[PDB]
């Protein structure tokens, strides 16, 4: 019950002492006077404890036996080398306690060092060690609570060996700080109550007042006490308690729109985690299953120090989020109210009120009034690229998966004329939510019947099965420049590793039929390394697209995975920088530098 | 000294020894005092294991079960015979390399490690995984990195290992040396992270894994500061702390050299949101950040 | 199997490799060198003879080469910009006539 | 493993071998001769680079050599004096880049 | 036609078949006549095996046991369907080689065999062992030589094999060709020996080994001479004898081309010390030395 | 009993014949008249045999049934194609025989061809086929035996088709040869007895006497009869019946000294091997166990034709041989008499007498009155060779195994001086039965105390343990020409594969310290191929030495075994000819030709 300002009561002991001699007194603090204390020891297990004796009421420490050299040997603690370390325990209740009474209550440790020597010559001591220890502990105090006596400052080692003079103390260099000093028992005492929200730390400077014949001896030591916060502050708000929310093209789960804050002047310990102090619990009061099952709230709290008069303060936060991935044909508008309660505040008011301005809207999956009419400049190659196709507002989609298809308009005709619909294909890209168009066969284009085609593109949203289509026409006007001999077999371009060849190849991904050429100049490993690519638009872009994954001989640069040789940097996939005129083969790559 | 599991096998044979061991595992689970006496006399009660072998998890589990039920105060991990290894492992400075008094020492340690055929191997081993990108979200797999780093600082001879991590060089920041002295443990993976958690929370995190627990029990016990001695330490051994600190690397407590004018060190943590208990965090960090024994120890290796 | 093809070594800077790295780290490079004549067969003698005759205009098939069949452990290093790079299969461990 | 390092053949008289036999018998000789650049490692690139630099005065270690990893069956024949001779390991059966 | 061992497995299942087979193996060892009838009807009574397979020793043993107890007169080794193979194996001449009308044909056959990858292999195979010196007393191990020679003349296609052994070329002796035509089977090892034994003694020697016995039963049956026909043979097939004669090579009867103006052949033997039975030896040798069917057959291949 | 001049009685048969019609008669020969014959058939198993009928006494063949087309089908013999072949059997005893009587006696085969045609037109035949068959058999006769009628010469196929005229025969172109012709039964008959030892073959020329209206038709055929020898000739001798034998230095087993012959005018069939005719059995009549257990006889017989009036005659042979390998301390002289008996001669005398002149002498295993005092020209190398040592008459030993040893004369002296007896060794060669002397260590010769040594050579015959020794002295006078730096490590010489190096090496087997050099010039594979050898005396010699077998780096040329590469000939071991400047390494050899 009665808390202990310190957990360390340390002193030194020596040989040649007598029973019935005071050694130390410990003090306890009570919030109200009806609790009267009664001191006592514990740790009755060991035998050396039978010598120490204590007074049930006053709280001072005595002894019941003298010291002898034989006693030094019987006390063993780890190593045999002096000094020897011992440890004891103590508790204080308001009524006569039993053996079992103190293993339940919180106690404190007493660490006393044992040396096998007698009292020293007291004129050989130094000034620095006269009135204060080597290292010191900083006690603590609690805000908004009754005051009392704090600590003892007499050292019984230096006070019992040379008792020819009297000593006192004093608080020094203080700009009216609420502390004091008694003279009857020379105890450091607190003047009156305090509020942590006003002052957080107390730098001090204490002195020893000694009476000496040569001159009055004053020695200065320093320390500072700490403050303990109790939740005596309810939260408030800056600004408003409302936020605007919009849901148009981002319907994926785990997305966030809103931002609301709150402030509590108290402090929120993170450890231990089984606490409740200044931790805000938020409750909703909406019963709609759709909204509740679909929407999510987020909680995240830190602490700040720069907006409370340079005092450590807490700041909660709250933001909106979705739960699951939503449909495209819904529309609702409402207000969400989310409450908060600081359960550790024993006051009439411990809450605030938030409000969200939610606007859920649907989206139309339709094409534009305009059509898509692509074309091909010249006689092309397999796995090329002509045009993209997307519904209106295609970039801004999120959480929307769409499949694209196409079909012929002339259903059934002679097979010879049916072949002319083998010179086109399609691809699908969930990243950009669009559709890429690439040729498939080239032996079809020779005929003049293929020169014009017509397709009906189909767009099918997965979740709702909605549909939308338009008319597509594709026209090739590139006459064959004396290249009939070549059958459907075209070499790659990633392996020319030179300008001269790469310009005169005809290979995969060649719209014009010639693969592109790059020339990166720099001193060392640069992000611009000379290569040969079919289309520079998306071959070294970084990652690969749906087309790049069809064949391994089409820009391995961004989609390759196997070991690479030479001077290079690389992320997960594909080379970011390689020292010089880099190149590749079917899966294996070698970035080097050509001295010639 | 002797291991624990060997003593375990020993006691599992004697009828009285194992019989009272079972009686005890039953007593502590909820005469029994008379059984305490027999246990103390057995070599197990004083059993302590060390490094260099390949069976420790079981020893550590055994001793933790024995004494946790009946961590920094009383450490098992190191017997009191390590001073014999300590003094001999204070010699490496003379054994390191003839060349000295250059503009940088970290680079010289790296040169020396890329010429021996054990440090080189293990260094590249706990390097490459820490630099391996396995997804566009992640940058590397830390489990592999920490484990490899650990099994390097366990085996490779001290002469070549400590040098790279403790190399001294002229004061300041942005001196080529300090860059490498900081980048020895590749902090981007094994050090950094998105958020800084309170040290105390990380202290509890360490307190569960069976390795970090012991590598931490070694720290306080060795490097404890005392100003009375000229050395600044308690147990008057400069290399004992030198080992204990390096025994933490890889574990949940992966420190590095902060950006401070002096030689300070902190784990990836800070005393934020600690509320009333800013004193405990401050003591932890101060013992870990600004101390005499550790500065003296790290400086000793510098004067080579 | 020839004993004249042996493992030699030379101390170099990483920069002498001309791979583009900027670092002051160093290394031991190891390599195979020496004659393999005691392991040749009738095949090689015929090749030698038709080469000396010039009767094969341009085709020049190879006789026994002394080459590594196993490589040393991986190496790592830090460049001047404090980025790490790693090199694999850079150095020989044991040599043989093949 | 390189596919440019292929197997070719040429029809010769035994006497073109210049091994000293006197016979009118004939044979099919087989051999491998092509590039194996697609199988090279960092080792070979370093070698190439130090050769082009001339920084190794005389040492000239070998890069990858398309050599035959197995030989054809034995052959027998009769010379002009009606004495038989036999030749072993004279012709390739299947080569690789080693 | 079907093999014998297959018919053996077949008859070993039927109760009556195997029961009477045992009754019989008992009867011939010393009603039984009624059991003869059942055996004749079984496919086993008319079973005949041939070449190209790898299980013959057992077939030959089976049939020899069946009929020897109850050799040239009635031969098993070849069914009456071989003429279909005979005529097709008379074509090889056109399939051999375009070049012709040179000063030597044996050399051309050798050239053709050192260009194919089966004849070449097997030729060097039954060559090298026959030229292997294994002691200062011996000159070669004949067992290996004969067996290799045999398994060559069993497999390698006739187009390339028969040519080297039957190559024709201008008359005389000391013409380069005849030297090779004689030295095809390396007689110094597979032909010669220190003493010439009487042929009849060698006839009995052959009559025990299970292979030479059949390869000889084929000879008389095929090449038997008759002057009434223009061909000069009995069964009007030039390649049947061509096969039967070549089927002896390797066995105890290893003939070669003697030094005679015409085309004569004799095994390594002579009708010396034969006493009264100079007639039997003379008939044997004459049938083997000077005949029309064999000269016509060997000449047919010559006109290509 | 009664032997058959022929084993083949062949005729042709046709359809349309009658029972009770003669077909053939067979004749048997009897040595004495009291044996009267009685003919009969056998092979009663088949059914077709029930038709044929025979006369018990006269010996002619008849039929009991006619021919019908149905009978042709029932007769099956292998293939179904005409002609069909049948076979019968016949025996003749002097008394009525049973079914069982003829499976025991020797019989003859009758091979008759069946054709399903009738009698032919008789004016369409040819002259050549008129009186004689296509192929004929040569009958045989026995020397010194009673004569009789031999063969029948009427062909019953031709006689029935044109029964118009009569035919006879005659022996033509004969220089008074003992044959004749009958006219009653037109049978070929022998005039009287004959002696094979006079005439061996009878070339004949027989004619057909036909009576024809156009002109008398004479047709000539030829044949020749053979003679059967009976042992009516005892052996004789040319020269003497004695031989000189000597046993001095060849005492190994299986060695032969003597040569004795004999002659028998008879012939000795080799086959069948279960016979006894003119095979000579030799018996000894000596009882001495030593001689009989130690000596061996050899038998080997051929036949000759050029010393009996161009008649085939037999010649036995006999030669002396040893049984086991004999001692060196024996001496005996005696006469061996070995008898022979021609057991197939039923005459009073069928033997001869031989005699051997054996002289067994001992051998002295002793050295010459002279000693062996070798020397070394210069400073030598390991595994060299200085001198051979052998007892008197050492080349001519055979069957004598000898071991050679050596020992020091100064038994015990200071160890430093004891070392000087480490610069010598010994070897042993059972081929030449001598002992080779080679140095072992070279670090010993550097002291002046080693300059003189003395050994006592020991020769110990294995079987008798005899001993013999002399005094050996070895002196080295080759001063060190500034070569102390070299420790005991010397390279081989078989691998220099060149003149220049080989002359300036110091290696194994170098007496002078330099290995020898060879230069074989020729066009191709010659027995003289240039190499480098330590000592040319025995390095390319042939059978490797006792020294050659110590190290593999000492002339592998003669004792190597592993595969060799290039142009070469080789016997069992070592290269006989290699195309050019051949060479070797440690076990592997490469004979090539150096174009430079
Ligand atoms: C937010 O409101 C608080 C109310 O106490 C005020 O002190 C603070 O200055 C405000 N923040 C601003 C104005 O940025
Ligand atoms: C539901 O409505 C009741 C009032 O009817 C309210 O108290 C409650 O907070 C609402 N939400 C939930 C989750 O109960
Ligand atoms: C050997 O003696 C026989 C005695 O019949 C004689 O005929 C023969 O000529 C002799 N051999 C000679 C003289 O060479
Ligand atoms: Ca307050
Ligand atoms: Ca508060
Ligand atoms: Ca609060
Ligand atoms: Ca891409
Ligand atoms: Ca006579
Ligand atoms: Ca006679
Ligand atoms: Ca006789
Ligand atoms: Ca020799």
Numbering used by the authors:
A (entry chain A), F (entry chain D): 22 to 617
B (entry chain B), E (entry chain E): 29 to 58, 74 to 113, 118 to 351
C (entry chain C), D (entry chain F): 138 to 235
What does the report in the manuscript say about this coordinate set?
GDNF family ligands (GFLs) when bound to cognate GFRα co-receptors recognize and activate RET stimulating its cytoplasmic kinase function. The bipartite GFL-GFR complexes are recognized by the RET receptor tyrosine kinase (RTK) forming ternary RET-GFL-GFR complexes (Cacalano et al., 1998; Durbec et al., 1996; Jing et al., 1996; Treanor et al., 1996). RET has four consecutive cadherin-like domains (CLD(1-4)) and a membrane-proximal cysteine-rich domain (CRD) in its extracellular domain (RETECD) (Anders et al., 2001).
An initial cryo-EM dataset collected on the reconstituted zRGα1a yielded a 3D cryo-EM map that confirmed a 2:2:2 stoichiometry, consistent with size-exclusion multi-angle laser light scattering data and similar to recently published human RET complexes (Bigalke et al., 2019; Li et al., 2019). Additional processing with symmetry expansion in RELION-3 (Kimanius et al., 2016; Scheres, 2012; Zivanov et al., 2018), improved the anisotropy and resolution of the map by addressing flexibility at the 2-fold symmetry axis, to produce a map with a nominal resolution of 3.5 Å. There are two major interfaces between zRETECD and its ligand-co-receptor at opposite ends of zRETECD, each is well defined in the cryo-EM map with side-chain level information. Comparison of site 1 of zRET in both the crystal and cryo-EM structure reveals differences in the conformation of residues 288–298 from a CLD3 loop. Comparison of all available liganded RETECD structures at site 2 consistently show a spacing of 44.2–47.0 Å between each pair of CRD C termini (measured at residue E613/620 in zRET/hRET) within an RET dimer.
